[PDB]
Every structure is written in structure tokens, then in C-alpha cells.
Paper text:
Alternatively, [name]Δα61–219 assembled with related but different lattices, termed [name]Δα6_L2 and [name]Δα6_L3. [name]Δα6_L3 was the only lattice in which class averages of aligned particles yielded a Fourier Transform with non-overlapping layer lines amenable to indexing. Only helical parameters with a rise of 2.16 Å and a rotation of 85.50° yielded a 3.7 Å-resolution map, with excellent side chain detail enabling model building from amino acids 1–217. Map quality was lowest around the C terminus of helix 5 (α5C), indicative of instability within interface 1—a trait observed for all [name] helical filaments, to differing degrees. [name]Δα6_L3 was 24.4 nm in diameter, with a hollow inner lumen that was 12.7 nm across. Specifically, [name] formed ESCRT-III-like protofilaments, in which hairpin motifs packed side by side and the α5C of subunit j bound across the hairpin tip of subunit j+3 to form the classical interface 1 domain swop. These protofilaments formed a 17-start right-handed helix that ran diagonally around the helical axis. Concurrently, each hairpin tip bound the N terminus of helix 5 (α5N) in a neighboring protofilament, thereby forming interface 3. Neighboring protofilaments aligned laterally to form a 4-start left-handed helix, in which subunits connected through the stacking of helices α0 and the formation of interface 2. The 4-start helix has a pitch of 44 Å and forms diagonal parallel ridges that encircle the helical axis and dominate the surface topology of the [name] helical filament.
The ESCRT-III-like protein [name] couples filament polymerization with membrane remodeling. It assembles planar sheets as well as 3D rings and helical polymers, all implicated in mitigating plastid-associated membrane stress. [name] activity is triggered by agents that threaten inner membrane integrity, including phage, mislocalized secretins, and antibiotics, whereas [name] is a plastid component in cyanobacteria, algae, and plants, in which it functions in thylakoid membrane biogenesis and repair. Given that two-dimensional (2D) planar sheets share a close geometric relationship with helical lattices, and as a means of understanding the interconnectedness of [name] polymers including rings, spirals and planar sheets, we determined the structure of four [name] helical filaments by cryo-EM.
Residue numbers in the entry:
A (entry chain A), B (entry chain A), C (entry chain A): 1 to 55
D (entry chain A): 166 to 217
E (entry chain A): 111 to 165
F (entry chain A), G (entry chain A): 56 to 110
Amino acid sequence: MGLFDRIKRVVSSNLNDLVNKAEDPEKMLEQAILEMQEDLVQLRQGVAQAIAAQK
Amino acid sequence: MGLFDRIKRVVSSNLNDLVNKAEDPEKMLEQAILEMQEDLVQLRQGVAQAIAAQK
Amino acid sequence: MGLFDRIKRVVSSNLNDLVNKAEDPEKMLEQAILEMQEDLVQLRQGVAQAIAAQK
Amino acid sequence: SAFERMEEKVLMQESRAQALGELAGADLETQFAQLEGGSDVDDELAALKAQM
Amino acid sequence: QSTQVETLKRNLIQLESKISEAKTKKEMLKARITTAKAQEQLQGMVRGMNTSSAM
Amino acid sequence: RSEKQYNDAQNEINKWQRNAQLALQKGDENLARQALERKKTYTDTSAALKASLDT
Amino acid sequence: RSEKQYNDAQNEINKWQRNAQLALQKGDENLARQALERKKTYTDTSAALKASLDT
């Protein structure tokens, strides 16, 4: 168990660098904005529910 | 039992060097940081729980 | 008997947390209201009986 | 009882999510910003009343 | 008999008032829930914490 | 584009101040309060946006 | 990048000192206490970071 942890850490580092090679700032910088807005939508709907209850 | 211990130590040294050959400092130095931050996240959540209790 | 009590308390804590994980505030907050109204119904019927006796 | 407990759970959840901010340290920034922004509406109303 | 019926009716009135108040609180807390379910996507906006993968 | 957004925010600030003028003339105190409250947020947004337009 | 981080920390130290000035002018003693407490941590961080920028 003191060796399988080390093996899995090595494998994880391999995979994480293999992924961090693929990330491209131009597209990621826009996907992040897209998801932020997509969540702001749900927050807006929640506030709408609250105001309707008040009405 | 005074011989199987020696055999298993030899096997363990073989495997440990076979692994320590694979470790690459460039990727490990970043996986370590990743995991440190991932744990700092949980510590932050714990402090959040504490402050909420105080509130 | 000073040990079976402890065992049963541990089992009860296990089960109670397993349940308190399942409770979901959105649905419980409405089931509580439903049951409160369902009991108000019977109270209304009792008052009806009383007024009929008076009549 | 199952209503009070659920109300408590919801309030605790919201308190945790909010306190995750005072943890961030934005409480001082909010206090300082509101120390200046709070009276702007009243001052503008008073000035406009004086003008009119 | 009339004296007793008076108290019974008053108690029923109080019951209805309490149920109405509980029904108002339910609608308030539902909106609180739906807001807090995404308010984390405000609170992750700070430059420090990584609890929001989007940011 | 950033400076155009600044200009739009600056325009709407004065628009809301003028509408507060109109409310105070013909309307009541609450309408002027609402108009001023909106104008405050608009001014804050304009200042924050210029802070980045500089860089 | 390291020296840029140093510069940012140094800037925010003086920012918080000025905000403590403002608090003491218009606010109370507790607000100035909080501002100074934050500024202390910022100064400590700046010094620690320069200690490594040298090497």
C-alpha cells in the first residue's frame, strides 16, 4: 500500500500532463465564460421565484 | 521466515527501483502542487462550516 | 447489558445518519404542510359535531 | 418537528454558503464601499428638493 | 354549550392562521434553497479559492 | 468596444438622474428613490469599467 | 512573474493602510483594527516573497 500509492501518483501525473498539453487558452477562456453565464441563468430563475412569492 | 523476508525485500527493491526510474521531476513537481491545492480546498470548506456555526 | 446498549446506540446512529442523508428540504417542507392541513380537516369536523349538538 | 428541522437545515446551508465569503475577506471591502455609497441617494434627494 | 362552542371556534381560527404562516414560510425557504444552490457560483468568483472549476 | 461600453453607462447614468428629476416634479418620493438607487449602481459600474479601460 | 507578485503585494499593503485612514476618519476603531490586521498579513507575505526573489 506504500507502493501502489506511488504507482498511482505516477500514472496520475502522466495523465494530467497529457491533458494539460491539450488545453488551449483561446477556447478555454471562452468556455469558462459560457459556463459562468449558464449558471447565472439559474440564479436569475431563483431570484424570480423569490420575487413571485413576495408578490 | 528468515529467508522469505529476505526474498520479499529483494523483490521490493527491484520494484521500487523500477518505479523510481519512471518518476519524472517536471510532471511530479506539478502533481504535488495540484494535490496540495485540492486538500486546501477541503480545509477551506471546514473553516466555512465553523464560521457558519458562529453566525 | 452495558455493552449491548452501546452496540445498539452505534447501530441507531448509523441508521439515523443514513436517513438524515435522504431527507430533502424541498419536498419535506411541503409534506409537513400537507399533513398539517390533513389534521386541520379532522379538527374542523369535530367543531362541526359540537355546533350540531348546540343546534 | 420535521418542518422545523428542515427550516434549520436550509438556514444552515445558506449561512455556510454566505460565510464562505467572509472567509474570502470581502466583508471589509463591502463595508468600506457601503460607507460611501449608502448616503448618495439621500444626499441627491435633498439636493434635488433644494433645487426644486 | 354556546360558551364552549365559542372557544372551539376561536381555536380553529388560530389553527388556520398558523397554517397560513407556515405556508408562507415554505415558499420563502424554497426560493432561499434555489438561490443558495448556485450562490456558490458567485462566491467562487474571488481570485483565491478554486472551489468553482468554472473560474 | 470597452470605451463604447463606458460611454453607454455614462449616458444612462444621466438619463436616470433626469428621470429622477421628472419623478420628483410630477411623481412621489419613492419613485425618485428607485431612480436614484438604479443610478447609483450604474455609476458604480461605470467607474469599475473605466478602472480596467485604463490598463 | 515573482517580482510582479512582489509589486502587487506592496501596492495592496499601502491600499489597506489608506483604507484604514478612511475608516479612522469616518468609521470606528474596529474597522481600523480589521484593516490594520489585514495589512499586517499582507506585509508579512510581501517580505517572505522578497526573501525568495533575492535567491
